[PDB]
Motif scaffolding. Sequence first.
Motif, PDB file in Angstrom:
ATOM      1  N   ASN B  45      22.178  77.119  64.557  1.00  0.00           N
ATOM      2  CA  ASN B  45      22.977  75.759  65.081  1.00  0.00           C
ATOM      3  C   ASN B  45      22.249  75.395  66.362  1.00  0.00           C
ATOM      4  O   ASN B  45      22.859  75.519  67.508  1.00  0.00           O
ATOM      5  CB  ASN B  45      24.401  76.058  65.341  1.00  0.00           C
ATOM      6  CG  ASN B  45      25.259  74.765  65.676  1.00  0.00           C
ATOM      7  OD1 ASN B  45      24.848  73.748  65.461  1.00  0.00           O
ATOM      8  ND2 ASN B  45      26.369  74.931  66.191  1.00  0.00           N
ATOM      9  N   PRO B  46      20.935  74.687  66.308  1.00  0.00           N
ATOM     10  CA  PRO B  46      20.446  74.400  67.497  1.00  0.00           C
ATOM     11  C   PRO B  46      20.736  72.926  67.955  1.00  0.00           C
ATOM     12  O   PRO B  46      20.157  72.516  68.952  1.00  0.00           O
ATOM     13  CB  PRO B  46      18.982  74.217  66.996  1.00  0.00           C
ATOM     14  CG  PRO B  46      19.078  73.889  65.410  1.00  0.00           C
ATOM     15  CD  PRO B  46      20.096  74.730  65.059  1.00  0.00           C
ATOM     16  N   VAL B  47      21.609  72.342  67.340  1.00  0.00           N
ATOM     17  CA  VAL B  47      22.385  70.998  67.761  1.00  0.00           C
ATOM     18  C   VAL B  47      23.346  71.349  68.889  1.00  0.00           C
ATOM     19  O   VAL B  47      23.359  70.620  69.789  1.00  0.00           O
ATOM     20  CB  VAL B  47      22.609  70.328  66.633  1.00  0.00           C
ATOM     21  CG1 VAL B  47      23.446  68.863  66.899  1.00  0.00           C
ATOM     22  CG2 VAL B  47      21.491  69.976  65.433  1.00  0.00           C
ATOM     23  N   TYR B  48      24.545  72.036  68.319  1.00  0.00           N
ATOM     24  CA  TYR B  48      25.650  72.169  69.286  1.00  0.00           C
ATOM     25  C   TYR B  48      25.579  73.479  70.103  1.00  0.00           C
ATOM     26  O   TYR B  48      26.194  73.809  71.097  1.00  0.00           O
ATOM     27  CB  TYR B  48      26.983  72.147  68.730  1.00  0.00           C
ATOM     28  CG  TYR B  48      27.161  70.801  67.754  1.00  0.00           C
ATOM     29  CD1 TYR B  48      27.326  69.684  68.497  1.00  0.00           C
ATOM     30  CD2 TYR B  48      27.152  70.687  66.394  1.00  0.00           C
ATOM     31  CE1 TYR B  48      27.664  68.417  68.104  1.00  0.00           C
ATOM     32  CE2 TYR B  48      27.121  69.508  65.633  1.00  0.00           C
ATOM     33  CZ  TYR B  48      27.436  68.169  66.559  1.00  0.00           C
ATOM     34  OH  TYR B  48      27.790  67.096  65.798  1.00  0.00           O
ATOM     35  N   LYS B  59      21.404  80.688  54.575  1.00  0.00           N
ATOM     36  CA  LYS B  59      21.376  79.338  55.077  1.00  0.00           C
ATOM     37  C   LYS B  59      22.583  78.867  55.956  1.00  0.00           C
ATOM     38  O   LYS B  59      23.559  79.031  55.406  1.00  0.00           O
ATOM     39  CB  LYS B  59      21.372  78.370  53.787  1.00  0.00           C
ATOM     40  CG  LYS B  59      20.203  78.467  53.029  1.00  0.00           C
ATOM     41  CD  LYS B  59      20.469  78.301  51.628  1.00  0.00           C
ATOM     42  CE  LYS B  59      20.050  76.887  51.506  1.00  0.00           C
ATOM     43  NZ  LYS B  59      20.449  76.058  50.110  1.00  0.00           N
ATOM     44  N   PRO B  60      22.402  78.311  57.063  1.00  0.00           N
ATOM     45  CA  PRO B  60      23.519  77.956  58.144  1.00  0.00           C
ATOM     46  C   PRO B  60      24.267  76.739  57.790  1.00  0.00           C
ATOM     47  O   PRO B  60      23.690  75.831  57.450  1.00  0.00           O
ATOM     48  CB  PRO B  60      23.029  78.132  59.335  1.00  0.00           C
ATOM     49  CG  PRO B  60      21.502  77.367  59.176  1.00  0.00           C
ATOM     50  CD  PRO B  60      21.270  78.010  57.896  1.00  0.00           C
ATOM     51  N   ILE B  61      25.678  76.748  57.985  1.00  0.00           N
ATOM     52  CA  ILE B  61      26.377  75.478  58.000  1.00  0.00           C
ATOM     53  C   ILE B  61      27.234  75.748  59.277  1.00  0.00           C
ATOM     54  O   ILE B  61      28.251  76.686  59.390  1.00  0.00           O
ATOM     55  CB  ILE B  61      27.518  75.701  56.561  1.00  0.00           C
ATOM     56  CG1 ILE B  61      26.641  75.874  55.432  1.00  0.00           C
ATOM     57  CG2 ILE B  61      28.315  74.481  56.741  1.00  0.00           C
ATOM     58  CD1 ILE B  61      26.535  77.268  54.665  1.00  0.00           C
ATOM     59  N   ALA B  62      27.137  74.814  60.216  1.00  0.00           N
ATOM     60  CA  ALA B  62      28.086  74.536  61.327  1.00  0.00           C
ATOM     61  C   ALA B  62      28.988  73.360  61.286  1.00  0.00           C
ATOM     62  O   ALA B  62      28.989  72.710  60.394  1.00  0.00           O
ATOM     63  CB  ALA B  62      27.111  74.362  62.711  1.00  0.00           C
ATOM     64  N   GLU B  63      30.270  73.476  62.217  1.00  0.00           N
ATOM     65  CA  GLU B  63      31.219  72.726  62.485  1.00  0.00           C
ATOM     66  C   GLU B  63      32.319  73.106  61.359  1.00  0.00           C
ATOM     67  O   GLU B  63      31.877  73.093  60.066  1.00  0.00           O
ATOM     68  CB  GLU B  63      30.855  71.345  62.425  1.00  0.00           C
ATOM     69  CG  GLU B  63      29.938  70.794  63.532  1.00  0.00           C
ATOM     70  CD  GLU B  63      30.672  70.683  64.862  1.00  0.00           C
ATOM     71  OE1 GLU B  63      31.822  69.983  64.752  1.00  0.00           O
ATOM     72  OE2 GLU B  63      30.325  71.224  66.024  1.00  0.00           O
ATOM     73  N   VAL B  66      33.161  70.892  58.475  1.00  0.00           N
ATOM     74  CA  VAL B  66      31.997  70.821  57.475  1.00  0.00           C
ATOM     75  C   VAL B  66      32.040  71.841  56.668  1.00  0.00           C
ATOM     76  O   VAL B  66      31.953  72.095  55.566  1.00  0.00           O
ATOM     77  CB  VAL B  66      30.451  70.667  58.253  1.00  0.00           C
ATOM     78  CG1 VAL B  66      29.397  70.773  57.296  1.00  0.00           C
ATOM     79  CG2 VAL B  66      30.454  69.486  59.097  1.00  0.00           C
ATOM     80  N   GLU B  69      34.776  72.107  53.886  1.00  0.00           N
ATOM     81  CA  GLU B  69      34.779  71.360  52.838  1.00  0.00           C
ATOM     82  C   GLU B  69      33.492  72.136  51.909  1.00  0.00           C
ATOM     83  O   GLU B  69      33.531  72.123  50.730  1.00  0.00           O
ATOM     84  CB  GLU B  69      34.023  69.841  53.189  1.00  0.00           C
ATOM     85  CG  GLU B  69      34.298  69.195  52.051  1.00  0.00           C
ATOM     86  CD  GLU B  69      35.252  68.069  52.122  1.00  0.00           C
ATOM     87  OE1 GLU B  69      35.161  67.022  51.087  1.00  0.00           O
ATOM     88  OE2 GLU B  69      35.936  67.845  53.058  1.00  0.00           O
ATOM     89  N   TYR B  70      32.483  72.661  52.680  1.00  0.00           N
ATOM     90  CA  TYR B  70      31.569  73.509  51.978  1.00  0.00           C
ATOM     91  C   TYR B  70      32.078  74.702  51.120  1.00  0.00           C
ATOM     92  O   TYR B  70      31.749  74.832  50.086  1.00  0.00           O
ATOM     93  CB  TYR B  70      30.426  74.197  52.879  1.00  0.00           C
ATOM     94  CG  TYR B  70      29.463  75.054  52.252  1.00  0.00           C
ATOM     95  CD1 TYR B  70      28.191  74.731  51.433  1.00  0.00           C
ATOM     96  CD2 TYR B  70      29.578  76.429  52.408  1.00  0.00           C
ATOM     97  CE1 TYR B  70      27.560  75.407  50.986  1.00  0.00           C
ATOM     98  CE2 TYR B  70      28.870  77.286  51.614  1.00  0.00           C
ATOM     99  CZ  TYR B  70      27.546  77.000  51.112  1.00  0.00           C
ATOM    100  OH  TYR B  70      26.514  77.626  50.447  1.00  0.00           O
ATOM    101  N   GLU B  73      33.878  73.199  47.968  1.00  0.00           N
ATOM    102  CA  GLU B  73      33.264  73.044  46.915  1.00  0.00           C
ATOM    103  C   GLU B  73      32.147  74.239  46.287  1.00  0.00           C
ATOM    104  O   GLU B  73      32.019  73.990  45.152  1.00  0.00           O
ATOM    105  CB  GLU B  73      32.092  71.768  47.273  1.00  0.00           C
ATOM    106  CG  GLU B  73      32.494  70.540  47.681  1.00  0.00           C
ATOM    107  CD  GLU B  73      31.870  69.356  48.240  1.00  0.00           C
ATOM    108  OE1 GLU B  73      30.757  69.847  48.534  1.00  0.00           O
ATOM    109  OE2 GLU B  73      32.319  68.365  48.210  1.00  0.00           O
ATOM    110  N   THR B  74      31.969  75.065  47.137  1.00  0.00           N
ATOM    111  CA  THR B  74      31.425  76.417  46.634  1.00  0.00           C
ATOM    112  C   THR B  74      32.264  77.265  46.107  1.00  0.00           C
ATOM    113  O   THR B  74      31.750  77.936  44.874  1.00  0.00           O
ATOM    114  CB  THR B  74      30.497  77.101  47.804  1.00  0.00           C
ATOM    115  OG1 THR B  74      29.714  76.065  48.523  1.00  0.00           O
ATOM    116  CG2 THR B  74      29.725  78.401  47.525  1.00  0.00           C
TER     117      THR B  74
END
Lengths: 215, 215
Positions: B45-48, B59-63, B66, B69-70, B73-74
């Motif tokens: 998470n280089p953004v937050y 594979k990373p999923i942040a927030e 978000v 919902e991932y 769907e997964t």
Amino acid sequence: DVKLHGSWVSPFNYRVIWALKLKGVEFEHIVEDLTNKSELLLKYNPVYKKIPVLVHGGKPIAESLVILEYIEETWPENPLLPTDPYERAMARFWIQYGATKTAAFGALFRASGEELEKAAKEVVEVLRVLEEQGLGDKKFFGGDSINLVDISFGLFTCWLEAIEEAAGVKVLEPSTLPRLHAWAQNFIEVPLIKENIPDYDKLLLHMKGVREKMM
Amino acid sequence: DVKLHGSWVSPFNYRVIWALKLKGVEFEHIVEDLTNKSELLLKYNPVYKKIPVLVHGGKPIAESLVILEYIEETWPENPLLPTDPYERAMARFWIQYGATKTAAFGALFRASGEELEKAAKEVVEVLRVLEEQGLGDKKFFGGDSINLVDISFGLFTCWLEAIEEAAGVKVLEPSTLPRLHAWAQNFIEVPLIKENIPDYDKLLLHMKGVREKMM
Ligand SMILES: O=c1cc(-c2ccccc2)oc2cc(O)c(O)c(O)c12
Ligand SMILES: O=c1cc(-c2ccccc2)oc2cc(O)c(O)c(O)c12
Ligand SMILES: [Cl-]
Ligand SMILES: [Cl-]
């Protein structure tokens, strides 16, 4: 069957116009006056009392990002989100990133001189993250054609250009954001967007007025 | 295969724990130290540079929103969103409403006396809209069982109770919000939630510390 309670300048309303025209959905555009709001707008959106509000079969859907996803699920042809869940999560991540950072653009209407130059540099850093980690080397955030991420960032094209001229600052320039600047030019040249954007002179007049009242 | 970079107090991290346990997804919980962040958290998470971060197959999923919902769907079994697009839009609308208004809870950690009573009343009005227009007469926001809307509002249960005790104010009471107060009690008694919530004394200690530093 489909009504859009909107405005001729709101970038949030234009996101919905683009998505409806991309799906080929016929709709009636009801341009509302924000000073004297109609009874329909107050009944349909009693929480925020603002536009855009999409009304489909008499049922209201408020908030541009909520409406976009409703449009994508209701008219699934000509998809505006990818099918892969990880790719869909990356799209939603960048949409929420823009929605959260859209607040840092407020300082462009308030600040002046050495304070406005600080706000403009912070906006450039917000756009640089989006350019490097979001856009990369793709022509559009949706790859070879626009998707909901491009639509959500469409306000960074002529609305942002109008804010820059009204505030006397530069934010999205080719030297500093080469790929995002080329994206903004490519987005605005997409015939669907080109035929559905407010007139620049009217948009500039709107931003000048907004900067005047917010000092 | 599934890793969650989290914390033992974050309500945002607990949303992800609930959703993973509702889907029956096995995961490794990596509790991060926010003072000295690990290299994995900065790369993912280089953004937050914050938690939660779900890592699925590297594979990373942040927030949290978000990630929810991932997850939906997964692992589509045991659905946490309705199938109807209008009902899904109403769910996303209330999730975004809570996410936008979560800022008005900040004043509960800063304000004091006649200023803190003003902030608490504004929080009550935010919760009343949610109770009347969002919950209504349903047992849960998801109807007869919890969905992503209930999960997103779970922070209004024991985290909010801890903020109230730390700040010396009352916000969610049965007299003023009868249906939302009954919902919060019902939510916290759901065995999945009951077995996966921070200890109240540790949560209260955390809120007291947060109020102390924010004055
Ligand atoms: O909140 C607003 C933000 C911007 C804007 C545009 C480009 C870049 C960043 C922000 O335009 C607007 C125009 C409107 O007519 C309106 O009612 C608004 O609330 C906004
Ligand atoms: O932003 C935060 C908001 C709240 C909160 C809880 C209940 C009702 C409203 C807000 O709890 C938190 C706890 C954390 O450990 C943390 O890092 C945070 O950023 C937050
Ligand atoms: Cl909107
Ligand atoms: Cl989060």
